[PDB]
Design a protein around this ligand. Structure first.
Ligand SMILES: Nc1ncnc2c1ncn2[C@@H]1O[C@H](COP(=O)(O)OP(=O)(O)NP(=O)(O)O)[C@@H](O)[C@H]1O
Ligand SMILES: Nc1ncnc2c1ncn2[C@@H]1O[C@H](COP(=O)(O)OP(=O)(O)NP(=O)(O)O)[C@@H](O)[C@H]1O
Ligand SMILES: Nc1ncnc2c1ncn2[C@@H]1O[C@H](COP(=O)(O)OP(=O)(O)NP(=O)(O)O)[C@@H](O)[C@H]1O
Ligand SMILES: [Ca+2]
Ligand SMILES: [Ca+2]
Ligand SMILES: [Ca+2]
Lengths: 309, 309, 309
DNA sequence: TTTTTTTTT
DNA sequence: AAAAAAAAA
């Protein structure tokens, strides 16, 4: 899986450790970089980069899979449950495995309570043979109270010390620190192959809407957000992990609410779960922009223990 | 149809297998390449390429067809239906057969639901004697859930295993991998003559808007998109297949929405179908830039089963 | 903690006093500024700012803390009590230490009486080993009667002259004077390290709702309020101090009351305490938007001596 | 050719 | 039941 199949196929050793300096560590990682962004890396020409692409092209089929073959090749995908069976039948078993899942709400709709539940119920063996693994959590506002994890872990009856161990944690401080933090994500997914299951970014747009002005720096903002969302799509298919992201809302005095991000974020997201408030601690959850499931509604219970019924 | 009529017309055998190395496999394929791009191929001079163009020019008429002759010669064209009779009377029978058809929407307007329907209703014998054939699908975002094909195939009452067999599938990963994937398309159209009917690119501009910067690399981007769209126009007339492409949108703070691509994509496209959202699961479809049909509107129903009424 | 670790790591002396001119005085302060807002400062290029970010990156771990490590690293946080044990069991021990706490009421609900109590009960050694320290108070309406502090200090039996000494005071006059007053806050937190515990802004939105018009200058107002609230989040984690803010209310003729600020203020606030009036001098306090504590209610007594039972 | 922001009473 | 303004690559 890692880059040593090219040594027996016409590539010497003096560039394998030079390609590993930028972040490329997988054979499919060479399939995902352009030939123009392999020259501006630190010390390679145009004459010797052509013989790397023909070296990698013999290892994977450059052909056309039949749709019957892709049906079995779409059995890598797991479905990570939420904590309530009314929210998983809505989503269709849980969260997808090679995709980006969005969720947005007003202000008290339970976004990080949905995030804090997933830090517990992804370490548990669910349906379909999903084994469970460790969890990357990139917090961005402040909200990673870890004693709330010890409050949800008791209703699933798991040990306290062995549920606070599989959650790796790192806080971003600005918009570019959120982008340079994805390099250590791709390394930790790669050096320990097969024991990571999801990646949670607590809010993508909580730092872009503050580090940029209004109409002046709008075009640089969406051209920097698109470079980040495409990198997350490649990470979620390199190592087959789920991605769950949340974002906030804004008003509309031109005509009520709508999520921020624009058309860049709405297109690059696979599923979007709207969230609003009901009576007491019930919450209503709709479905926006799903490839498979239709638009229905469900109900929550944000109790001590995350999401319930 | 293939290149062996030149052997009896002054061309030896030592270049026929040398022209087949680049991709030229048809007599009309020599009519579509320049005399300047036949020298930079791998091993031919200027003195021996002149005697190939005079060898091919005696086989097809270098004259002027009367418009009465071209009327019968425009009876190769079929029309592939959508799934609703309100959307085919708008388009004028369905999708054109020697052309490029575009469709763009906001984010939930049902673009890949329109694409997933065409993977089923092109294997069915429709009106005008259209027999039905296999389907090339080039996905670019992630969205080729094949179990949705088993959900539309039941409302047309066809067998499940014989509808998952005629869909060949390949995913592009970068912008140049999307261009080098068209070589295997032209070979698979050629080696099995007459059993392919359409080609679907899921999004052209979902990879160009991310692999290029703003005003810096704008001119290289549109000069690489124009090389791809012209290649698709030649493929759609070599083997007489339909081309259906989709693309996304952007805002306009200078003055609402407009499709990306610029003037290169709007000129090289034959028909453009705008798509917006109505109440519930109704959608409204307009017509932009059609050579034949006027500007009208229709209505959809994106149910389990693709497009309905 | 201050910026002298870079002198032994490839940074000369000619920019350390030039970075101190804008406000950057801590090693983590370089972790919180962008690379784009380090060029427009007064005299630095793009070629010499790259070697500052690599100089600071070796000092702190650019890695991933385990959640067991972050549990001990969340023991910096203290909890500043209010004055009644019914309001601290509701909040969960008191006010948070790395967060922004909001409180809103109708007009007589006791917002500045809640603020005037905190100027006294933060100089007292409470539970959990909280030592007590000095207090920054940014008043914005007019309401900092200091003889009310001598009325609450007697029920805690502390000396009068040594409770009027630890309260530094400054009044803002317009919206931008409220923003330029935070520069002297960050300097006074830095030059006397470890003897400041909270920062009180008396009202954020008492000056934004008057210096701006209706729908005309709405977008500039929320784009200037978001620049201020993010700066307060960084201050509250640079030096580990609490932030307590209050704001007012408005009606709703479209359909009763709701707090001003919009979705910018509701998202950037960590905890919100609603306040209403009961019979006599009892007041009722609810909880809006808390990461840890559920929605319950309590009771007050605004007597001579601040908040009681 | 590119790119959406923001509730008041 | 009514009210709009914002630009740089
Ligand atoms: N232990 C708990 N038991 C019950 N409800 C709780 C508990 N902790 C928090 N809540 C509720 O959960 C809600 C807060 O959810 P939260 O995860 O903060 O959503 P949020 O949208 O991220 N808030 P914000 O990030 O500011 O927009 C509030 O209604 C709290 O009252
Ligand atoms: N089985 C189904 N029944 C009914 N509606 C469905 C079904 N599956 C998906 N939908 C709806 O179809 C819409 C999604 O259409 P889609 O094909 O994703 O358009 P799209 O523009 O390609 N989305 P995107 O590519 O991100 O822009 C959503 O409104 C879904 O709720
Ligand atoms: N010495 C005192 N003893 C008891 N109650 C007092 C005393 N001084 C003031 N109050 C009460 O405190 C209340 C005013 O508290 P205050 O914190 O000023 O509310 P407020 O919300 O700030 N008013 P405003 O700023 O205009 O919204 C009134 O009900 C007064 O009667
Ligand atoms: Ca939150
Ligand atoms: Ca799609
Ligand atoms: Ca007051």
């Amino acid at each position: 899986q890692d880059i040593d199949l090219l040594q027996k196929h016409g590539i010497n050793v003096a560039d394998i450790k030079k390609l590993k300096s930028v972040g490329i560590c997988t054979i499919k990682g060479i399939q995902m970089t352009t030939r123009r962004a392999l020259c501006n890396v630190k010390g390679l020409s145009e004459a010797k980069v052509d013989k790397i692409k023909e070296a990698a092209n013999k290892l994977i089929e450059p052909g056309f899979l039949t749709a019957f073959e892709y049906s079995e090749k779409r059995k890598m995908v797991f479905h990570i449950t939420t904590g309530s069976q009314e929210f998983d039948k809505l989503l269709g078993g849980g969260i997808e495995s090679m995709a980006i899942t969005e969720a947005f709400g007003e202000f008290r709709t339970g976004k990080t309570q949905l995030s804090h539940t997933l830090c517990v119920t992804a370490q548990l063996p669910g349906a379909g043979g999903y084994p469970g693994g460790k969890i990357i959590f990139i917090d961005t506002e402040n909200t990673f109270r870890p004693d709330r994890l010890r409050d949800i872990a008791d209703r699933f009856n798991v040990d306290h010390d062995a549920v606070l161990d599989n959650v790796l944690y790192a806080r971003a401080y600005t918009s570019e620190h959120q982008m340079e933090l994805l390099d250590y994500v791709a390394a930790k997914f790669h050096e320990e192959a097969g024991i990571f299951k999801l990646l949670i970014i607590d809010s993508i747009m909580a730092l872009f809407r503050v580090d940029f002005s209004g109409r002046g720096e709008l075009a640089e903002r969406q051209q920097k957000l698109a470079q980040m969302l495409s990198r997350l799509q490649k990470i979620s298919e390199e190592y087959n992990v789920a991605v769950f992201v949340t974002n906030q809302m804004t008003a509309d005095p031109g005509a009520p609410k709508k999520p921020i991000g624009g058309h860049i974020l709405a297109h690059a997201s696979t599923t979007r779960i709207s969230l609003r408030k009901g009576r007491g601690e019930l919450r209503i959850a709709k479905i926006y922009d799903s490839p498979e499931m239709p638009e229905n509604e469900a109900t929550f219970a944000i109790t001590a223990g995350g999401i319930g019924d």
